[PDB]
Structure 1
């Protein structure tokens, strides 16, 4: 029997089989239900829901990393098992991922749904950042996970996330796409609709980068066309992307760009390290692992190296690891974990659930 691995992303579900080096299914965490409640299908999931948005009211049940609507979440899992993976959930142990700091009531509800709704023989809930650390071949370090709806700094000791030291930033890829749409619209273009958001997301993913020195890069952009890139829009017209290439991901280091009064990702990394035991801090500084789609920007590891170096004691050995596969490292780490012989000891069995109820997840999964 093969274990299933389902990464419940704020923007995208990444799902597949343990032992594989990539997910089989990647789709939007979206559920659509008819806008009129009166008299083909009662609900739609992912790409199908987005295409029928004129007919449906769309909901994002994991918008900020934490599941808020269980009826919509059950539709997402049903779609994942039956439509994407084409499997009978009752035949497979299932590894689910969860956000850092996921409330106790939420992980209990996730456990109850897997056993009572899907009848899985066994399951486990792992924190997303921990799996990314495992995908980098490590068990101790600090992960910066920036996804679609949320970003976290998660320090981890021998496979165990340290919740007292986790930092959350309420900004990730979705906010960067919206900010890019706004600063391009400021030039006289118009990027406001759902179809225009997809164009801007493509511009962001293809042309954006993190500047090593923002103020110097802004001066270079205003003095020459050396940083300019041309992009062909769907209508055939051409738009020049200049300083927006690096102003867009600059928001990760300067959240005031979108009116947020939060510290930047380099400052939350430092803060999270300092909340951990003195004895582990050198190991965290030497093992900063980047993960998630919003860490894909070229230049981000070199910028983090410079920023963390400026903050830390000058003798501190600092290392930033940004794997090529970091867009899927949470899923890959789950595949690694669920394919190990040690995982058979970690899963929660249906027998354990029948004895203890949903609160068994507090004891077994951390």
Structure 2
């Protein structure tokens, strides 16, 4: 979507080699706005958000309101035409599907992970949206460890070091006896 909206300013990236350049630009410049409407109004009038970047052959580009419009898709998937709601409402819907007794604990113990949740300014937008959706009295906490990118691998390393985990592995004998469909069994 960023590569598609960058054509509105003059720069065109098409070949698959340049998708890495667009990815780097997204990683380096994009940020998630706390409130979308007022920020969009400001960015179209003032000039304090327009930031410059250097392509790998020179030819510096200047991105304006595209900084916070590309990551806005996560909270509003109508940009790409997808039907579902944003990630701020999918979380609440998955919470409400749970039983009525464990909604408070999930409210107070929301956890974030993944590389794409590394955008500067997502933990506050998520908090605001969830507060808007969830009942007002409950306390809402969004856990955002500094090491979000490697959280999954750190968890895997911790899991592989446990003593009680030593009998959960799929023995090669079991595969030879039952075939590749052994994974679907109680041996996950």
**Shared topology, TM-score over 0.5?**
yes
CA distance in 1, matches of 2:136, 2:183: 42
| Paired residues of 1:207 and 1:245 also in contact (CA < 8 A) | yes
Q: Write the mapping of 1:64-79 to structure 2, written as runs, cut at 5 A.
A: none
| Per-residue deviation, 1:310 | 0.4
| Per-residue deviation, 1:277 | 1.6
CA distance in 2, matches of 1:283, 1:270: 13
CA distance in 1, matches of 2:181, 2:18: 45
CA distance in 2, matches of 1:355, 1:305: 50
Match of 1:348, SS? coil
Match of 2:58, SS? coil
Greater relative CO, 1 or 2 (CA 8 Å, sep 6+): 1
Q: Could you give the per-residue CA deviations for residues 46-89 of structure 1, whole angstroms, max 9, x where no partner exists?
A: xxxxxxxxxxxxxxxxxxxxxxxxxxxxxxxxxxxxxxxxxxxx
**Residue in structure 2 matched with residue 304 of structure 1 by the alignment:** 126
Q: Which of 33, 48, 54 in structure 2 is aligned with 1:226?
A: 48
TM-score after normalising by structure 1: 0.49
Match of 1:355, SS? helix
CA distance in 1, matches of 2:103, 2:173: 40
**Residue in structure 2 matched with residue 152 of structure 1 by the alignment:** none
| Per-residue deviation, 1:326 | 1.3
| Paired residues of 1:183 and 1:244 also in contact (CA < 8 A) | yes
| Per-residue deviation, 1:356 | 4.4
**Residue in structure 2 matched with residue 293 of structure 1 by the alignment:** 115
Match of 2:136, SS? coil
| Alignment length (residue pairs) | 188
CA distance in 1, matches of 2:73, 2:118: 14
Unaligned runs of 5+ in 2: none
| Paired residues of 1:293 and 1:326 also in contact (CA < 8 A) | yes
CA distance in 1, matches of 2:5, 2:175: 51
TM-score after normalising by structure 2: 0.93
CA distance in 2, matches of 1:218, 1:230: 19
Q: Could you give the per-residue CA deviations for residues 179-214 of structure 1, whole angstroms, max 9, x where no partner exists?
A: 111111111211111122111111100010110001
| Per-residue deviation, 1:357 | 4.2
Q: Could you give the per-residue CA deviations for residues 115-134 of structure 1, whole angstroms, max 9, x where no partner exists?
A: xxxxxxxxxxxxxxxxxxxx
CA distance in 2, matches of 1:194, 1:356: 42
Match of 2:61, SS? strand
Kindly tell me: are residues 224 and 348 of structure 1, through their superposed partners in 2, closer, same or farther at Cα, counting changes over 3 Å? same
Unaligned runs of 5+ in 1: 1-178
| Paired residues of 1:212 and 1:303 also in contact (CA < 8 A) | yes
Cα RMSD, aligned residues only: 1.6
| Per-residue deviation, 1:353 | 3.5
| Per-residue deviation, 1:331 | 1.5
Q: Could you give the per-residue CA deviations for residues 137-195 of structure 1, whole angstroms, max 9, x where no partner exists?
A: xxxxxxxxxxxxxxxxxxxxxxxxxxxxxxxxxxxxxxxxxx11111111121111112
Match of 2:126, SS? helix
| Paired residues of 1:285 and 1:319 also in contact (CA < 8 A) | yes
| Per-residue deviation, 1:246 | 0.5
Match of 1:291, SS? coil
CA distance in 2, matches of 1:294, 1:345: 34
CA distance in 2, matches of 1:234, 1:288: 39
| Per-residue deviation, 1:354 | 4.2
- Kindly indicate which of the two structures has a greater share of residues assigned to helix: 2
| Per-residue deviation, 1:355 | 4.6
| Paired residues of 1:348 and 1:364 also in contact (CA < 8 A) | no
| Per-residue deviation, 1:297 | 0.4
- Kindly indicate which of the two structures has a greater share of residues assigned to strand: 1
Match of 1:302, SS? helix
Match of 1:278, SS? coil
